Enzyme design. Structure first.
Site, mmCIF file in Angstrom:
data_model
loop_
_atom_site.group_PDB
_atom_site.id
_atom_site.type_symbol
_atom_site.label_atom_id
_atom_site.label_comp_id
_atom_site.label_asym_id
_atom_site.label_seq_id
_atom_site.Cartn_x
_atom_site.Cartn_y
_atom_site.Cartn_z
ATOM 1 N N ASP A 7 0.909 -1.167 0.000
ATOM 2 C CA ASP A 7 0.000 0.000 0.000
ATOM 3 C C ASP A 7 0.938 1.206 0.000
ATOM 4 O O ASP A 7 1.535 1.464 1.035
ATOM 5 C CB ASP A 7 -0.894 -0.010 1.241
ATOM 6 C CG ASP A 7 -1.693 1.262 1.473
ATOM 7 O OD1 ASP A 7 -1.814 2.068 0.534
ATOM 8 O OD2 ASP A 7 -2.193 1.427 2.595
ATOM 9 N N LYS A 68 2.785 11.461 -3.384
ATOM 10 C CA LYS A 68 1.607 10.838 -4.040
ATOM 11 C C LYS A 68 0.710 11.939 -4.612
ATOM 12 O O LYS A 68 0.005 11.670 -5.589
ATOM 13 C CB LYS A 68 0.866 9.945 -3.042
ATOM 14 C CG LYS A 68 -0.221 9.060 -3.623
ATOM 15 C CD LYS A 68 -0.642 7.998 -2.646
ATOM 16 C CE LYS A 68 -1.890 7.261 -3.073
ATOM 17 N NZ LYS A 68 -2.240 6.199 -2.105
ATOM 18 N N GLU A 172 -7.203 0.803 -4.456
ATOM 19 C CA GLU A 172 -7.174 0.600 -2.985
ATOM 20 C C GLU A 172 -8.523 0.063 -2.477
ATOM 21 O O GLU A 172 -8.493 -0.861 -1.661
ATOM 22 C CB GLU A 172 -6.791 1.919 -2.310
ATOM 23 C CG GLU A 172 -5.335 2.287 -2.501
ATOM 24 C CD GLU A 172 -5.010 3.757 -2.307
ATOM 25 O OE1 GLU A 172 -3.891 4.156 -2.656
ATOM 26 O OE2 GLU A 172 -5.878 4.492 -1.814
ATOM 27 N N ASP A 196 -13.077 5.060 3.301
ATOM 28 C CA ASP A 196 -11.629 5.074 3.627
ATOM 29 C C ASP A 196 -11.246 6.444 4.175
ATOM 30 O O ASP A 196 -11.030 7.350 3.376
ATOM 31 C CB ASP A 196 -10.831 4.693 2.379
ATOM 32 C CG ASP A 196 -9.346 4.469 2.594
ATOM 33 O OD1 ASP A 196 -8.799 5.000 3.571
ATOM 34 O OD2 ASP A 196 -8.754 3.752 1.773
HETATM 35 K K LIG Z 1 -1.742 2.727 -2.015
HETATM 36 K K LIG Z 2 -8.213 7.575 2.585
#
Ligand SMILES: [K+]
Ligand SMILES: [K+]
Ligand SMILES: Cc1n[nH]c(=O)[nH]c1=S
Length: 536
Positions: A7, A68, A172, A196
């Site tokens: 991840d 990111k 994800e 999330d």
């Molecule tokens: K990721």
């Molecule tokens: K998140």
């Protein structure tokens, strides 16, 4: 040896391996199952992970994080321009591409976001190698569902620079669903909502799962919402409390605010398991000890707008997916902030008491799913939507994908032009709005329509699929009973699971263009006498 699941998160990264029938999340050299996505450049060395995060206050200009946010993006992108304002490190424009610029060993150095992420991936690869006692090359790396092809390719490039062979880049939310085994459930399609809230972003994803195939119906959220926002509300409250009690503002002292923030973070975690937390700081400011307490209810009040606001993306995702909340079969909690009881209560109350999937550590679920998928890569329902071409080359679906077989679906169509002598029935398979982007399976013509104004003739088109999967398409002129039909054979092995996945992925990639496109043709049940794709 076994492939790993990684991840690559905005704030932290997590690596897992599927071995001995179980997923093991791998701890780093400091014993931590998560590693900060931070790279620090100093006069003497490059630090990655915990070491980099630990020294951020001492070396802010040369400590890089949030790569990111820049990955796969152009410098002139509005997100990059807004984000750069909040970063201590410099971001520079190299020929339209953003680069982080830092001082390393006395020299100015510039790195593309994929290079910084490659350094985080190198640490994760090394952590896995120390645990497995062997070289790790194969990996599955996760990305947000909303990532475009450029962001996905740049993420793969970061793995390639790190020496990893990226078997696949997976969403994800899909990884979280795989972790809960939601793709192992045989039967009718299931609608899954992934909530999330962690890593500095809030992501809501709605997925449909049938026959091992995942489709992303909708995504919604806030790219700038996370636990730090909840901690800030506590920090501001305590600054006010100290000012009211001692007539002193501690805001001027950076270390005092830093110590208060660290105490608030710890207190917030205590509030997930306890109704009250103690704040004990010796000599916080001007020699004054700060000993106090905060209740869970007070913490909830300080963050009430933020916690309630999480439901707004849930409502938007449901609207975009064209689904009622009652149609969600599975809800999955991902991210550390989902531990907060008020957030769990708000989501459960919104879903009328529905139980939430939260048994897997929310910080590790995405890596856990990636590890399961990596091992698989290391070793009846309709596959695709079925329909006919309507005027303008539009795909009109008669049978949606994931429809249980056998099935029979009938719709009524009309002529697009006045005195139209015939209609051409063109059968297509795919998830795109326009037939040119779908697969032509067969065509037949219904001629002899009695002359009438456009919109008057009624043509009944029936799609019949047997248990063997054979498709019979028939059209009847409702005015005379005259009919024509085609039988479409289902060759075994005509479509691989990967072929189906690619068609579904293309629909996800062009969802905005296709969804906007559907609005163009006024009728939606009008048939022409010609193939639009062959028209000059
Ligand atoms: K990721
Ligand atoms: K998140
Ligand atoms: C509230 C909370 N936030 N983040 C985390 O990692 N744990 C907890 S208990």
């Amino acid at each position: 040896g076994p492939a790993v699941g990684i991840d690559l998160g905005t704030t932290y990264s997590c690596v897992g391996v599927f071995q001995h029938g179980k997923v093991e999340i791998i701890a780093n050299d400091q014993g931590n199952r998560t590693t900060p996505s931070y790279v620090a450049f100093t006069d003497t060395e490059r630090l990655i992970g915990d070491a980099a995060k630990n020294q951020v206050a001492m070396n802010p200009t040369n400590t890089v994080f949030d790569a990111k946010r820049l990955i796969g993006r152009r410098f002139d992108d509005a997100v990059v321009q807004s984000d750069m304002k909040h970063w201590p490190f410099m971001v520079v424009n190299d020929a339209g591409r953003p680069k982080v610029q830092v001082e390393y060993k006395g020299e100015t150095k510039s790195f593309y976001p994929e290079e910084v992420s490659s350094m985080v991936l190198t640490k994760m690869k090394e952590i896995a190698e120390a645990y497995l006692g062997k070289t790790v090359t194969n990996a599955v790396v996760t990305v947000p569902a909303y990532f475009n092809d450029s962001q996905r390719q740049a993420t793969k490039d970061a793995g390639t620079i790190a020496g990893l062979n990226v078997l696949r880049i997976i969403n994800e939310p899909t990884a979280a669903a795989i972790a809960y085994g939601l793709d192992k459930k045989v039967g009718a399609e299931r609608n899954v909502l992934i909530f999330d809230l962690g890593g500095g972003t809030f992501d809501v994803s709605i997925l449909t799962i049938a026959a091992g195939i995942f489709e992303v119906k909708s995504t919604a959220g806030d790219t700038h919402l996370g636990g730090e926002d909840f901690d800030n509300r506590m920090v501001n409250h305590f600054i006010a409390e100290f000012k009211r009690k001692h007539k002193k503002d501690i805001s001027e002292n950076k270390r005092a605010v830093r110590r208060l923030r660290t105490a608030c973070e710890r207190a917030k975690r205590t509030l997930s398991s306890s109704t009250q937390a103690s704040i004990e700081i010796d000599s916080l400011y001007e020699g004054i000890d700060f000993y106090t307490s905060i209740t869970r209810a007070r913490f909830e009040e300080l963050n009430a707008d933020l916690f309630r606001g999480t439901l707004d993306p849930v409502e938007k995702a449901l609207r975009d997916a064209k689904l009622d909340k009652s149609q969600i079969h599975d809800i999955v909690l991902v991210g550390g902030s989902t531990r907060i009881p008020k957030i769990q209560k708000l989501l459960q109350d919104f879903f009328n008491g529905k139980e939430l999937n939260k048994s897997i550590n929310p910080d590790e679920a995405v890596a856990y799913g990636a590890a399961v998928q990596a091992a698989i890569l290391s070793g009846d329902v309709t596959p695709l939507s079925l329909g006919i071409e309507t005027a303008g080359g539009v795909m009109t679906v008669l049978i949606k994908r994931n429809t249980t077989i056998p099935t029979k679906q009938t719709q009524t169509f009309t002529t697009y032009s006045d005195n139209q002598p015939g209609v051409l029935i063109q059968v297509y398979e795919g998830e795109r709005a326009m037939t040119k982007d779908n697969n032509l399976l067969g065509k037949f013509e219904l001629t002899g329509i009695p002359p009438a104004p456009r919109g008057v003739p009624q043509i009944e088109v029936t799609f019949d699929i047997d248990a063997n999967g054979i498709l019979n398409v028939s059209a009847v002129d409702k005015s005379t009973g005259k009919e024509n039909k085609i039988t479409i054979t289902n060759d075994k092995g005509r479509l691989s699971k990967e072929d189906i996945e690619r068609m579904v992925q293309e629909a996800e990639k062009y969802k905005a263009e296709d969804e906007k496109q559907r609005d163009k043709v006024s009728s939606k049940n009008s048939l022409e006498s010609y193939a639009f794709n062959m028209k000059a």
